[PDB]
UniProtKB/TrEMBL annotation, chain C:
Role description: Binds as a heterodimer with protein bS6 to the central domain of the 16S rRNA, where it helps stabilize the platform of the 30S subunit.
Annotated organism of origin: Escherichia coli (strain ATCC 9637 / CCM 2024 / DSM 1116 / LMG 11080 / NBRC 13500 / NCIMB 8666 / NRRL B-766 / W)
UniProt protein name: Small ribosomal subunit protein bS18
GO annotation, biological process: translation
Cited Gene3D superfamilies: Ribosomal protein S18 (4.10.640.10)
A Pfam family this chain is assigned to: Ribosomal_S18
Assigned keywords, A-Z: Ribonucleoprotein, Ribosomal protein, RNA-binding, rRNA-binding
InterPro entries: Ribosomal_bS18, Ribosomal_bS18_CS, Ribosomal_bS18_sf
MF-aspect GO terms: small ribosomal subunit rRNA binding; structural constituent of ribosome
Record-level GO cellular component terms: cytosolic small ribosomal subunit
Subunit organization: Part of the 30S ribosomal subunit. Forms a tight heterodimer with protein bS6.
Gene: rpsR
Amino acid sequence: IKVRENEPFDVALRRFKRSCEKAGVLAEVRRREFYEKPTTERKRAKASAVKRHAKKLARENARRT
Amino acid sequence: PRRRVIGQRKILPDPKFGSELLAKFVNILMVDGKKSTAESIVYSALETLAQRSGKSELEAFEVALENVRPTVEVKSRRVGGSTYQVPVEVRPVRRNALAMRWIVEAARKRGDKSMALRLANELSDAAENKGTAVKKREDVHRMAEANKAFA
Amino acid sequence: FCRFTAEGVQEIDYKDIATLKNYITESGKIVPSRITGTRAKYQRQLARAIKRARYLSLLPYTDRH
Amino acid sequence: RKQVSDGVAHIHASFNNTIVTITDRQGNALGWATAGGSGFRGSRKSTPFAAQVAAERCADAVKEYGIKNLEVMVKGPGPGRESTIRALNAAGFRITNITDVTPIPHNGCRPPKKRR
RNA sequence: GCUUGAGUCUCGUAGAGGGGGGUAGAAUUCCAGGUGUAGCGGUGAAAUGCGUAGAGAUCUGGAGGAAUACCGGUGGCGAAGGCGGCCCCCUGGACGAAGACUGACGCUCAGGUGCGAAAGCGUGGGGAGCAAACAGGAUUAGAUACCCUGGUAGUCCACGCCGUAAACGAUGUCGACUUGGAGGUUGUGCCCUUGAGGCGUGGCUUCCGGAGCUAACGCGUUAAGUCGACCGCCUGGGGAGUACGGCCGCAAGGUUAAAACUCAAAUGAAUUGACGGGGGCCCGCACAAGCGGUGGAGCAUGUGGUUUAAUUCGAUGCAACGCG
């Protein structure tokens, strides 16, 4: 949120904004509550995240590369 | 095209003095492959440019070429549902290409007597950016200036 | 991956704000247990401590006060 | 003109427009310029270049105030939020510090349903 | 009579479990004031709307209602619906340790009773934002829709009514047995806490999978497997979960629940193509970048139409029309 880079900056270097959200929560509550889709989109979020992890421990094929 | 990056054919310079840029200029004026008649016009308009300016044949064309040579053009790069233009820098081998093309098409209009009198005046007004040859370079920048917010 | 009172056992206190500042970012937000590696038992207790220190004005809710 | 020393430059970079207002340290505005006031009507209002030219047209009419150093208040996502402050640093000003003043609610009022 | 079923006590553990009462921060809205100037807002674009009565922006002060960013996690609790800022009070349920006690007190359950999302209804308040209805502006051939500007009921509270959901892991409750692995969460025992530990034993839960089952998909120690107890439900599709009558309800409506007639189908899984205003990759004067044309004029030819006694017949989207 706050960044100084006291004397020798000469450039923004403002990665502390994107270090927490800077867009994430403000482009999430500006519309679309549903009281429902946060449950559905989060059930499928970890459902696909664990299959990317399941194939992360099951990629032991030769694949000839 | 789709995949091939071509290598263009070699161009033979003008058979009066070494100038490959002039060899492409007569090709833009070129109608129905009549090279002999087309070379007679790119000559007779060139010394007549020299008597009206006191320069040589090579340097007088380059004076009028810099006023018809653009630097940025607008192309339609589709991002999604909206449709606008995108300004990009002109390639150096492309900079003269539509610059020499604008001189010919502007000399296609405004008929005084004959073609040799047309592009000779077209090179005269483009030497001090007066005629329509530089205006067709001017207005391209207006679409480039009004759409330069797309990058 | 780091560890906390799950090994060096002590009860979570809302008054020792010196240790509580290590588990909040510069914006005052609570750092998740997926970064610090703390157990879920003490993360819930830590969450109450941060909320309690925010109530007693020992830790800021944010930096925009 | 009052010859002020320092000031604060508030930036209201909304989704459709970017409002750049330079105030003093006490919050009293000294001048402003918006992307939609600098021409650019329609789709060209919400672009980082229009936010960039909004700071350039906010670089003048202040200056008579003689501002040398200023703080930047960034609010809203904006199409820019980086070009409008890059032009402010290149306008002849001293960027002391930057903070985010986005009005992020802690689950307050209910968001609308619009834009399906 | 007895103890492995069930139950009670003793000591602890976790939890958004429920009800009542306060309190904190951010944010939105509104009011007043200060600074300050032509746009603000919105969209693919635009306009309705707001603004020179001075808007938008910024600051200060104040008034209100709602909900609790981060923590936050196929994490936890509850029979289900459902429940998350913090604190005070009351209180329910679950689990673990090793003991003590009763002694089959158990399981299920038609009827019956209670709880029961949201919307809605009755009475009294409240109303910030959101938002049916409705208005205006847009799109469209038309748009009483999707878009935008507003905006009432409602969303909030107190007491009742309604008892309806795709109330769904679409899988009733209780009990026993049957390869396993990888995790989460919460107790506990032993060993060295000798070092972000090692070895076991319980409750809940997530994923993958052996046998087995299934029409297949898939389930798979929380089984849709192997067995027992009980209740409810189905007998092709439409009609129809409709009418009639009964019961409940202020109403909306809910529950019970046919028949006539009509059809030889309806349906589920999976398979091969096709299609997608689905995704990923690639190609072709397909696009792009340029040149020269047609469509404007005359003429030649062909076709259709018209006409005629005949204006022979065939081709007549691309792939017929200077064709046979």
